[PDB]
Amino acid sequence: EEVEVGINRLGVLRADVDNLGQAFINGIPDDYLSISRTATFSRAMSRFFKNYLNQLLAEKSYKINVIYAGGDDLFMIGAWQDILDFSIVLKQKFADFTQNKLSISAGIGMFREKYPVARMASLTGDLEDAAKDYTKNAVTLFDATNVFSWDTLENDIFVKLDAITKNFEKLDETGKAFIYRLIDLLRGVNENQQINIARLAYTLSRMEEKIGKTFAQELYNWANADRKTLIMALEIYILKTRE
RNA sequence: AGGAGUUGAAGCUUGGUUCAAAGAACGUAUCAAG
């Protein structure tokens, strides 16, 4: 109820450190090998997760309830806006703490307000298992069909989302019916590949004078080069801007 | 004293202009949370 910007959903993060097993067992090489170094390694990992997770969630008023944390396990239920905006924060702070050599995978799920927590946790655990099945670092946005690498998600999806949010704000009457027709074409293009690309070019030059001279050609470029990213960018755009 | 021979011929048969715009994109109830 404090959120008054997006869709009334509850977003769920489950994360775990991948490849933690052989790194914890035999990670430090045999030449410069110490026992207290391993003690600092594991004690610093648990230390990081506990105190930096509480401080990173305290410094900005994130509407996130942490259930439990740890290296092996992480489970947080909150508003989906803060969960999505905090997953990149947690990934980058883990990369800074571990000097970006311990990988991390995660799974973001999104559920309605009154949903059972047991089925919630099982579904999001399934999502993050599908993320770690890719066998590298990745994340699933809301579904097992949308698996993205962390740099891919962060860079591609968030620059496309920020560009879309800059462009459709200054437009006075374009959204959101144009965006729904655009998503209809960009998900029909998976099966009927040619005619939806033709309809896409037709609509973009149709609304060249309306949505912008350069944004329409940018959408036409993005919808051929890195397509599947832009569908998720538009979907989370509407999920953010729904009143 | 009137007879014949032409009863229409050629040209254009539509030209250009916007060719679905804005809205809603599931809401609730058990499930859950408290």
Side-chain angles (χ1 to χ4, degrees), chain A residues 109-151:
Chain A
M110 182 178 72
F111 309 89
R112 59 202 159 96
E113 171 188 2
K114 293 182 181 180
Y115 204 61
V117 192
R119 192 57 197 145
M120 198 169 273
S122 66
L123 279 160
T124 313
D126 186 74
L127 259 54
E128 61 86 20
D129 291 331
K132 83 176 68 161
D133 291 331
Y134 175 57
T135 63
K136 304 286 101 175
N137 49 328
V139 63
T140 61
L141 277 297
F142 310 140
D143 196 4
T145 62
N146 302 132
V147 182
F148 302 115
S149 179
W150 268 122
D151 56 344

Side-chain angles (χ1 to χ4, degrees), chain A residues 162-228:
Chain A
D162 206 4
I164 283 157
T165 318
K166 294 181 176 67
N167 279 278
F168 280 111
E169 169 59 41
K170 63 184 182 69
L171 294 174
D172 195 20
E173 59 272 13
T174 307
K176 301 184 289 293
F178 168 60
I179 296 92
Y180 278 67
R181 296 191 279 100
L182 184 56
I183 290 177
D184 186 74
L185 287 174
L186 281 165
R187 283 186 315 210
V189 67
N190 174 55
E191 183 178 1
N192 308 317
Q193 189 274 331
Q194 296 289 283
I195 195 61
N196 291 292
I197 281 289
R199 284 171 196 164
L200 181 60
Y202 174 74
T203 46
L204 283 169
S205 296
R206 183 176 176 87
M207 294 177 71
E208 173 86 13
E209 294 293 328
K210 193 156 271 291
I211 77 158
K213 297 296 289 183
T214 60
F215 184 47
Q217 216 274 335
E218 210 160 13
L219 290 173
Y220 188 65
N221 289 321
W222 285 346
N224 288 287
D226 198 29
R227 177 173 69 84
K228 190 168 68 67

